[PDB]
Design a protein around this ligand. Structure first.
Ligand SMILES: *C(C(=O)O)[C@H](O)C(=O)N[C@@H](CC(C)C)C(=O)NCCCCNC(N)=[NH2+]
Length: 212
């Protein structure tokens, strides 16, 4: 795998979103990975519906949090609508996949990166954007403005984001806090520290969609 990956440059990453007060980070991360894998496989960059996953992923808990693996398995089992057909409202509602016509895209499954393994996660990112989790509760992360973030932070992961690239010393993360946080909505998180958990627990739980 190459020294640098940046899925924004390959045209596989949509604009940065803002989840608002809703605890829907798991849905944004999953959606980032769906938009990415659809561009990689089909050549088209589309925006997909975080709201659909928020409403319809029964394994998850709506705005009270959820599981990126459940959302990705939801898109593989049924599918997902375009963001425009099923836009984001910032509150959980009734599942409306059934009334919004056929699904816009569908994947074929969901694989997990071997946890606590930096190289395994890098291998994943070189193939597609990957859904990852991290500890975002610390004020240090909340106030991040730029640079290679090294913490301080623990490993008590609580926030789902998306890894969309990496470099020799960092992993590039698309957050869902709007374009005004961090590096235009992104954070570069230090890697290579030898902490098996990753900075802010970044290696705790990583999933990516599969598309034949
Ligand atoms: C994301 C956010 O807005 O920060 C949101 O809180 C979330 O999905 N949190 C996850 C943790 C990450 C995915 C690691 C979470 O808490 N998942 C477990 C389910 C939600 C909490 N439990 C219940 N019953 N609601």
């Amino acid at each position: 795998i190459p020294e640098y990956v940046d899925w924004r440059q390959k045209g596989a990453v949509t604009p940065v979103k803002n989840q608002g007060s809703c605890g829907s980070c798991w849905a944004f991360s999953a959606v980032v990975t769906i938009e990415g894998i659809i561009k990689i496989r089909t050549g088209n960059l589309n925006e997909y519906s975080e709201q659909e996953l928020l409403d319809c992923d029964r394994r998850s808990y709506g705005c009270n949090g959820g599981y990126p693996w459940s959302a990705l398995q939801l898109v593989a089992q049924y599918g997902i609508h375009y963001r425009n057909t099923y836009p984001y409202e910032g509150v959980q509602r009734y599942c409306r996949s059934r009334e919004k016509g056929p699904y816009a895209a569908k994947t074929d499954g969901v694989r997990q990166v071997q946890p606590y393994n930096e190289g395994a996660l890098l291998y994943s990112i070189a193939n597609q954007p990957v859904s990852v989790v991290l500890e975002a509760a610390g004020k240090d992360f909340q106030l991040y403005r730029g640079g290679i973030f090294v913490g301080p932070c623990g490993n008590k992961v609580d926030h789902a984001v998306a890894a969309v690239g990496y470099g020799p010393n960092y992993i590039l993360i698309k957050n869902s806090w709007g374009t005004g946080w961090g590096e235009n909505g992104y954070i570069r998180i230090k890697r290579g520290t030898g902490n098996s958990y990753g900075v802010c627990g970044l290696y705790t739980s990583s999933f990516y969609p599969v598309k034949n």
